[PDB]
Amino acid sequence: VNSFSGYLKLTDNVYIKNADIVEEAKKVKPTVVVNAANVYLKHGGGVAGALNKATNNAMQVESDDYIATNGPLKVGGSCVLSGHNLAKHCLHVVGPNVNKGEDIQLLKSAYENFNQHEVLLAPLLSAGIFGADPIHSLRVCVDTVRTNVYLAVFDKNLYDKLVSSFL
């Protein structure tokens, strides 16, 4: 038993709620919050900008040191950094951004990173400003992640659409 509240169960291991991941993180303080990162860990907008803002830019400062030491991530890849005031850890995961022209097949590889963590609070990868179909992102999540994932979907109308179309 964990501390997540009001999630709709979708599968054995996937749960979903209409909420801002930032607000869910501040309330729950999960072991792992997933960031919808880019390969440069430049946290400007959407999930990344919102989480980073909630850390008072400490996420960005830590990220810049990570990139200076290690270079960029791969599309489909991830790294574990601090969760700052929001979580114990932040798993920065790079889903493909089709608005930038990347391969959607890499979305499954991106979700595979979640399997290295027993429980995660996460957003819908490659959706929103990343340009991919959200119904598809949810399907890939359910068909790829085997650990316990609590999905926060910020957009009320998107949430309604995802629940009503879920197979």
Ligand SMILES: O=C(OCCN1CCOC1=O)c1ncnc2[nH]ccc12
């Ligand atoms: O951007 C997010 O996810 C992608 C799908 N979208 C687009 C806008 O609304 C959505 O749900 C998202 N999710 C959960 N918490 C969030 N806090 C800020 C952004 C955000």
